Amino acid sequence: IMIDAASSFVLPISITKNVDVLQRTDEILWFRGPSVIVNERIINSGDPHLSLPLNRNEKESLPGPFVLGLRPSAKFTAHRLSMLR
Amino acid sequence: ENNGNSVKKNWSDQEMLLLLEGIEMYEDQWEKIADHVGGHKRVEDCIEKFL
Amino acid sequence: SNIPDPTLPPTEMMTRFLHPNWYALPTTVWLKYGNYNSWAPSFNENGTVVD
Amino acid sequence: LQEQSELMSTVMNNTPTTVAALAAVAAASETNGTIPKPRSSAQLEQLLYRYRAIQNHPKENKLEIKAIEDTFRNISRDQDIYETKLDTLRKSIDKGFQYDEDLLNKHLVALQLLEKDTDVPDYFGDPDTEIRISARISNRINELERLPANLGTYSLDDCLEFITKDDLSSRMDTFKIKALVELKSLKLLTKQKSIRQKLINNVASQAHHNIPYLRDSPFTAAAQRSVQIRSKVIV
């Protein structure tokens, strides 16, 4: 198991004409491995569909992942904006 | 964070964490311990805070 | 690291202190010559503090 | 022999019907020393509910079902007695007392500190007692070495930051740092004692060259003068 590997490669031909959305050096960084997509960094460990209680085949499509993201209500945000000035 | 901190002898959680990280790294050579906090803390002051 | 666990049997932290107000000072040394010597200089002092 | 933990292991192993702890006269009576009346809220009561719901099918191979039903009758009787006492308590309330605020502030701080086993003030050598200190230090060490590493925070001030689906706000690790500063300060406790022994035995070993009232003493000045006497030569 090695730690001090390079894991970064840049092609010498500069085709930096229409490339401004990627991660530039400031050239294009090319890794040895792909990227990973994480939807929400917070996990609601309640919400008993995930915790599976032992009391009582059912399908249910919940609206959006934001149930599992601890999203606050807009009234507290409006109250904090009223407390801002 | 990487920006400059507040006035000295405040000792926030980053400055308290990095010193205890560096002591577990080197255990001596306080010149190599003061710069692990970020360099803005003195060698004579980090010892007084750790004691 | 190489630090020991804090549930170690040496933890007294004060066993060889020997504070300088507890130092023994050189005082006058009484000498004995025999059983029938009552005119000799009895005790001796060289660098003594007290009488 | 951990009769309350064997049912939890059988529920976690998803095989509580093939053996069901083999409750007999030599097995169900050896681990119990009638179930011993567990005191948990729902962590050991739902296991008894599942243990009753599974064994409804054999219906004769287990003889402790009568003891479990008597325990459930006792639980229902205690619930009814608690509801009647709650009704009597809510009907026995006086109209006016005018309870003060300072005594409430004195009770809440003390009741909060007595939850998690820490010291609270009143405001109303010796190796036998050092092992008791080390056993409380190692208790907090073994408690802090059981926390999950994937600990994140959420304060009530993040609504001014407008966290999107991929935002990575800078107030996520405000408690993970403080959960490691304590864990690594309880380990460097013997590390700082060596620095303190090297400091105190160098600032206090002399104690008569920087302190003025100890070097201005008639005994100390005469002693420091008399220890530097050079020996006299002969002829």
Side-chain angles (χ1 to χ4, degrees), chain A residues 38-42 54-55 65-66 70-72 76-77 80-81 84, chain D residues 46-47 49-50 154 156-160 162-166 168 172:
Chain A
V38 177
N39 292 318
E40 293 177 353
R41 299 292 178 90
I42 183 168
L54 295 174
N55 289 318
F66 54 88
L70 279 76
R71 296 291 184 268
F76 180 74
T77 305
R80 181 64 181 270
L81 290 173
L84 191 146
Chain D
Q46 299 296 321
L47 294 175
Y49 291 162
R50 185 177 182 270
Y154 183 77
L156 294 175
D157 294 331
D158 291 331
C159 64
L160 295 174
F162 297 100
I163 291 95
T164 323
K165 188 66 67 178
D166 193 0
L168 272 71
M172 188 64 72

Short mmCIF file of all heavy atoms in Angstrom, two decimals, chain A residues 38-42 54-55 65-66 70-72 76-77 80-81 84, chain D residues 46-47 49-50 154 156-160 162-166 168 172:
data_model
loop_
_atom_site.label_atom_id
_atom_site.label_comp_id
_atom_site.label_asym_id
_atom_site.label_seq_id
_atom_site.Cartn_x
_atom_site.Cartn_y
_atom_site.Cartn_z
N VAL A 38 -22.41 12.35 -4.29
CA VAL A 38 -23.14 12.20 -3.04
C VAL A 38 -24.31 13.18 -3.05
O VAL A 38 -24.12 14.38 -3.28
CB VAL A 38 -22.22 12.45 -1.82
CG1 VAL A 38 -23.01 12.35 -0.53
CG2 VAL A 38 -21.07 11.46 -1.82
N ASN A 39 -25.52 12.66 -2.82
CA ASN A 39 -26.71 13.49 -2.90
C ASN A 39 -26.82 14.43 -1.71
O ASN A 39 -26.82 15.66 -1.86
CB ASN A 39 -27.96 12.61 -3.00
CG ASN A 39 -28.04 11.85 -4.31
OD1 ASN A 39 -27.76 12.41 -5.37
ND2 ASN A 39 -28.41 10.58 -4.24
N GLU A 40 -26.91 13.88 -0.50
CA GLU A 40 -27.02 14.66 0.72
C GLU A 40 -26.00 14.15 1.72
O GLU A 40 -25.87 12.94 1.93
CB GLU A 40 -28.43 14.57 1.31
CG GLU A 40 -29.50 15.25 0.45
CD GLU A 40 -30.89 15.09 1.03
OE1 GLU A 40 -31.05 14.34 2.01
OE2 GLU A 40 -31.83 15.72 0.49
N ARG A 41 -25.27 15.08 2.34
CA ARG A 41 -24.21 14.74 3.29
C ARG A 41 -24.73 14.41 4.68
O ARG A 41 -23.95 13.96 5.53
CB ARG A 41 -23.20 15.89 3.38
CG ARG A 41 -22.52 16.21 2.07
CD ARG A 41 -21.59 15.08 1.65
NE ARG A 41 -20.96 15.35 0.36
CZ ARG A 41 -19.80 15.98 0.22
NH1 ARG A 41 -19.14 16.42 1.28
NH2 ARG A 41 -19.30 16.18 -0.99
N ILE A 42 -26.02 14.63 4.94
CA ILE A 42 -26.62 14.39 6.24
C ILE A 42 -27.63 13.25 6.10
O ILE A 42 -28.36 13.16 5.11
CB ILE A 42 -27.27 15.68 6.80
CG1 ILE A 42 -27.84 15.47 8.20
CG2 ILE A 42 -28.27 16.30 5.82
CD1 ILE A 42 -28.22 16.76 8.90
N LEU A 54 -40.30 -3.01 14.91
CA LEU A 54 -40.87 -4.35 14.93
C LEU A 54 -42.37 -4.35 15.23
O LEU A 54 -42.89 -5.34 15.76
CB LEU A 54 -40.13 -5.21 15.95
CG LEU A 54 -38.66 -5.50 15.63
CD1 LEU A 54 -37.99 -6.25 16.77
CD2 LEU A 54 -38.53 -6.27 14.32
N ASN A 55 -43.08 -3.27 14.90
CA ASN A 55 -44.52 -3.18 15.12
C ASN A 55 -45.20 -2.86 13.80
O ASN A 55 -44.96 -1.80 13.23
CB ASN A 55 -44.85 -2.12 16.17
CG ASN A 55 -44.45 -2.54 17.57
OD1 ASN A 55 -44.64 -3.69 17.97
ND2 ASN A 55 -43.90 -1.60 18.33
N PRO A 65 -35.78 13.81 -1.92
CA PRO A 65 -34.86 13.34 -0.87
C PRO A 65 -34.79 14.24 0.35
O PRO A 65 -34.17 13.85 1.34
CB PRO A 65 -33.50 13.30 -1.60
CG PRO A 65 -33.83 13.30 -3.05
CD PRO A 65 -35.06 14.13 -3.17
N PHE A 66 -35.41 15.42 0.31
CA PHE A 66 -35.28 16.42 1.37
C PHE A 66 -35.96 16.02 2.68
O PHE A 66 -35.78 16.73 3.68
CB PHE A 66 -35.82 17.78 0.89
CG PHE A 66 -37.24 17.74 0.36
CD1 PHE A 66 -38.33 17.89 1.20
CD2 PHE A 66 -37.47 17.58 -1.00
CE1 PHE A 66 -39.62 17.86 0.71
CE2 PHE A 66 -38.76 17.55 -1.50
CZ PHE A 66 -39.84 17.70 -0.65
N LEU A 70 -32.98 16.88 6.79
CA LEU A 70 -33.23 17.77 7.93
C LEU A 70 -33.43 19.22 7.48
O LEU A 70 -32.75 20.14 7.93
CB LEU A 70 -32.12 17.67 8.99
CG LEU A 70 -32.12 16.52 10.00
CD1 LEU A 70 -31.66 15.21 9.39
CD2 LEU A 70 -31.27 16.87 11.21
N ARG A 71 -34.38 19.40 6.57
CA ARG A 71 -34.63 20.74 6.04
C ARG A 71 -35.52 21.53 6.98
O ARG A 71 -36.61 21.05 7.33
CB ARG A 71 -35.27 20.65 4.66
CG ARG A 71 -34.39 20.01 3.61
CD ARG A 71 -33.19 20.89 3.28
NE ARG A 71 -32.38 20.33 2.21
CZ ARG A 71 -31.33 19.53 2.40
NH1 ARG A 71 -30.98 19.19 3.64
NH2 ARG A 71 -30.65 19.07 1.37
N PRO A 72 -35.11 22.72 7.41
CA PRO A 72 -35.94 23.51 8.31
C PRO A 72 -37.09 24.19 7.57
O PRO A 72 -37.16 24.18 6.34
CB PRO A 72 -34.97 24.55 8.87
CG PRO A 72 -33.97 24.72 7.78
CD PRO A 72 -33.82 23.36 7.14
N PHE A 76 -38.80 30.07 10.32
CA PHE A 76 -37.62 30.39 11.11
C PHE A 76 -36.60 31.20 10.32
O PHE A 76 -35.93 32.07 10.88
CB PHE A 76 -36.98 29.11 11.64
CG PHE A 76 -35.75 29.34 12.48
CD1 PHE A 76 -35.86 29.83 13.77
CD2 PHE A 76 -34.49 29.05 11.98
CE1 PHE A 76 -34.73 30.03 14.55
CE2 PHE A 76 -33.36 29.25 12.75
CZ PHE A 76 -33.48 29.75 14.03
N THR A 77 -36.49 30.94 9.01
CA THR A 77 -35.59 31.72 8.17
C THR A 77 -36.10 33.15 8.01
O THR A 77 -35.31 34.10 8.07
CB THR A 77 -35.43 31.04 6.81
OG1 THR A 77 -34.99 29.69 7.00
CG2 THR A 77 -34.40 31.76 5.95
N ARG A 80 -35.36 34.89 11.28
CA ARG A 80 -33.96 35.26 11.37
C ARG A 80 -33.64 36.46 10.48
O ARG A 80 -32.84 37.32 10.85
CB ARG A 80 -33.07 34.06 11.03
CG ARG A 80 -31.58 34.33 11.11
CD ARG A 80 -31.17 34.67 12.54
NE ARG A 80 -29.74 34.96 12.64
CZ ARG A 80 -28.81 34.05 12.89
NH1 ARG A 80 -29.15 32.78 13.06
NH2 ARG A 80 -27.53 34.41 12.97
N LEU A 81 -34.27 36.53 9.30
CA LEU A 81 -34.15 37.71 8.46
C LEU A 81 -34.79 38.94 9.09
O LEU A 81 -34.32 40.06 8.85
CB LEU A 81 -34.76 37.45 7.08
CG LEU A 81 -34.02 36.48 6.17
CD1 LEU A 81 -34.83 36.19 4.92
CD2 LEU A 81 -32.64 37.03 5.81
N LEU A 84 -32.27 40.09 11.46
CA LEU A 84 -31.02 40.56 10.86
C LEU A 84 -30.95 42.09 10.89
O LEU A 84 -29.91 42.66 11.24
CB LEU A 84 -30.90 40.02 9.43
CG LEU A 84 -29.58 40.14 8.65
CD1 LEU A 84 -29.42 38.93 7.74
CD2 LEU A 84 -29.52 41.41 7.80
N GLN D 46 -40.16 -4.49 23.46
CA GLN D 46 -40.51 -4.92 22.11
C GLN D 46 -39.90 -6.28 21.77
O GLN D 46 -40.49 -7.02 20.97
CB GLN D 46 -40.05 -3.87 21.09
CG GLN D 46 -40.70 -2.51 21.27
CD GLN D 46 -42.20 -2.53 21.04
OE1 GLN D 46 -42.69 -3.22 20.15
NE2 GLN D 46 -42.93 -1.78 21.86
N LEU D 47 -38.76 -6.61 22.37
CA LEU D 47 -38.22 -7.96 22.24
C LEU D 47 -39.12 -8.99 22.89
O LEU D 47 -39.31 -10.08 22.34
CB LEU D 47 -36.81 -8.03 22.84
CG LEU D 47 -35.72 -7.22 22.14
CD1 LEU D 47 -34.43 -7.29 22.93
CD2 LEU D 47 -35.51 -7.71 20.72
N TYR D 49 -42.39 -8.52 23.17
CA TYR D 49 -43.55 -8.54 22.28
C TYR D 49 -43.31 -9.45 21.08
O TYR D 49 -44.19 -10.24 20.71
CB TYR D 49 -43.88 -7.12 21.81
CG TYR D 49 -44.42 -6.20 22.88
CD1 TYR D 49 -44.39 -4.82 22.69
CD2 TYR D 49 -44.94 -6.69 24.07
CE1 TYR D 49 -44.88 -3.96 23.66
CE2 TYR D 49 -45.43 -5.84 25.04
CZ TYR D 49 -45.40 -4.47 24.83
OH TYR D 49 -45.88 -3.62 25.80
N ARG D 50 -42.12 -9.37 20.48
CA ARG D 50 -41.76 -10.26 19.39
C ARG D 50 -41.61 -11.71 19.85
O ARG D 50 -42.00 -12.63 19.13
CB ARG D 50 -40.46 -9.78 18.74
CG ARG D 50 -40.03 -10.54 17.50
CD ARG D 50 -38.78 -9.94 16.89
NE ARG D 50 -38.37 -10.62 15.66
CZ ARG D 50 -37.54 -11.66 15.62
NH1 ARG D 50 -37.03 -12.14 16.75
NH2 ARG D 50 -37.23 -12.22 14.46
N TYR D 154 -25.25 20.60 13.06
CA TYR D 154 -26.19 21.51 12.40
C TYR D 154 -26.64 22.53 13.43
O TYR D 154 -27.42 22.20 14.33
CB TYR D 154 -27.38 20.75 11.81
CG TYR D 154 -28.33 21.65 11.05
CD1 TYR D 154 -28.01 22.09 9.77
CD2 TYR D 154 -29.52 22.08 11.61
CE1 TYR D 154 -28.87 22.92 9.06
CE2 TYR D 154 -30.39 22.91 10.92
CZ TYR D 154 -30.05 23.33 9.65
OH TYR D 154 -30.91 24.15 8.95
N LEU D 156 -28.41 26.36 14.50
CA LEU D 156 -29.61 27.11 14.14
C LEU D 156 -29.28 28.43 13.45
O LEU D 156 -30.16 29.30 13.35
CB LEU D 156 -30.46 27.36 15.38
CG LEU D 156 -31.09 26.13 16.03
CD1 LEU D 156 -31.82 26.50 17.31
CD2 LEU D 156 -32.03 25.43 15.05
N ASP D 157 -28.05 28.60 12.97
CA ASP D 157 -27.63 29.81 12.28
C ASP D 157 -27.28 29.55 10.82
O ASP D 157 -26.76 30.44 10.15
CB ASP D 157 -26.44 30.44 13.00
CG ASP D 157 -26.80 30.95 14.38
OD1 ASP D 157 -27.97 31.32 14.59
OD2 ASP D 157 -25.91 30.97 15.26
N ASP D 158 -27.56 28.35 10.31
CA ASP D 158 -27.21 27.99 8.94
C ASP D 158 -28.19 28.53 7.91
O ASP D 158 -27.88 28.51 6.72
CB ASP D 158 -27.12 26.46 8.82
CG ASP D 158 -25.94 25.88 9.57
OD1 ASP D 158 -24.92 26.59 9.71
OD2 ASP D 158 -26.04 24.72 10.02
N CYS D 159 -29.36 29.02 8.34
CA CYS D 159 -30.38 29.48 7.41
C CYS D 159 -30.00 30.76 6.69
O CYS D 159 -30.60 31.09 5.66
CB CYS D 159 -31.71 29.68 8.15
SG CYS D 159 -31.68 30.98 9.41
N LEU D 160 -29.01 31.50 7.20
CA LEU D 160 -28.46 32.65 6.50
C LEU D 160 -27.39 32.27 5.49
O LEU D 160 -26.87 33.15 4.80
CB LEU D 160 -27.88 33.65 7.50
CG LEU D 160 -28.88 34.33 8.45
CD1 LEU D 160 -28.16 35.19 9.47
CD2 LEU D 160 -29.89 35.15 7.66
N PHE D 162 -27.79 29.52 3.16
CA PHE D 162 -28.50 28.99 1.99
C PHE D 162 -27.78 27.76 1.42
O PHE D 162 -27.25 27.77 0.30
CB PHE D 162 -28.69 30.08 0.92
CG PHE D 162 -29.55 31.22 1.37
CD1 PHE D 162 -28.97 32.41 1.79
CD2 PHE D 162 -30.93 31.11 1.38
CE1 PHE D 162 -29.76 33.47 2.21
CE2 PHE D 162 -31.72 32.17 1.80
CZ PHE D 162 -31.13 33.35 2.21
N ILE D 163 -27.77 26.70 2.23
CA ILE D 163 -27.11 25.46 1.84
C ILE D 163 -27.92 24.78 0.74
O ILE D 163 -29.11 24.47 0.92
CB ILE D 163 -26.92 24.53 3.06
CG1 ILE D 163 -25.88 25.10 4.03
CG2 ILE D 163 -26.53 23.13 2.62
CD1 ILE D 163 -26.44 25.91 5.18
N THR D 164 -27.28 24.55 -0.40
CA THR D 164 -27.91 23.94 -1.56
C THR D 164 -27.73 22.42 -1.43
O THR D 164 -27.36 21.92 -0.36
CB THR D 164 -27.29 24.55 -2.83
OG1 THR D 164 -27.04 25.94 -2.59
CG2 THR D 164 -28.27 24.51 -4.02
N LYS D 165 -28.01 21.66 -2.49
CA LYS D 165 -27.82 20.22 -2.48
C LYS D 165 -26.34 19.85 -2.36
O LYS D 165 -26.00 18.84 -1.73
CB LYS D 165 -28.42 19.61 -3.75
CG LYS D 165 -28.46 18.10 -3.80
CD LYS D 165 -29.42 17.55 -2.76
CE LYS D 165 -30.85 17.92 -3.08
NZ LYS D 165 -31.81 17.37 -2.09
N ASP D 166 -25.46 20.67 -2.93
CA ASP D 166 -24.01 20.47 -2.84
C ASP D 166 -23.41 21.83 -2.47
O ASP D 166 -23.07 22.63 -3.35
CB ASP D 166 -23.45 19.93 -4.16
CG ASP D 166 -22.03 19.41 -4.03
OD1 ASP D 166 -21.46 19.46 -2.91
OD2 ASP D 166 -21.48 18.94 -5.05
N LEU D 168 -21.54 22.33 1.10
CA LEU D 168 -20.44 22.11 2.05
C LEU D 168 -20.19 23.35 2.92
O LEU D 168 -19.17 24.04 2.80
CB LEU D 168 -19.15 21.65 1.35
CG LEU D 168 -18.96 20.15 1.13
CD1 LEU D 168 -19.89 19.59 0.06
CD2 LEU D 168 -17.51 19.86 0.77
N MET D 172 -19.83 22.31 9.96
CA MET D 172 -20.19 20.90 10.05
C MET D 172 -19.40 20.16 11.12
O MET D 172 -19.93 19.24 11.75
CB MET D 172 -19.98 20.23 8.68
CG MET D 172 -20.49 18.81 8.57
SD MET D 172 -22.28 18.70 8.75
CE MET D 172 -22.83 19.40 7.20
#
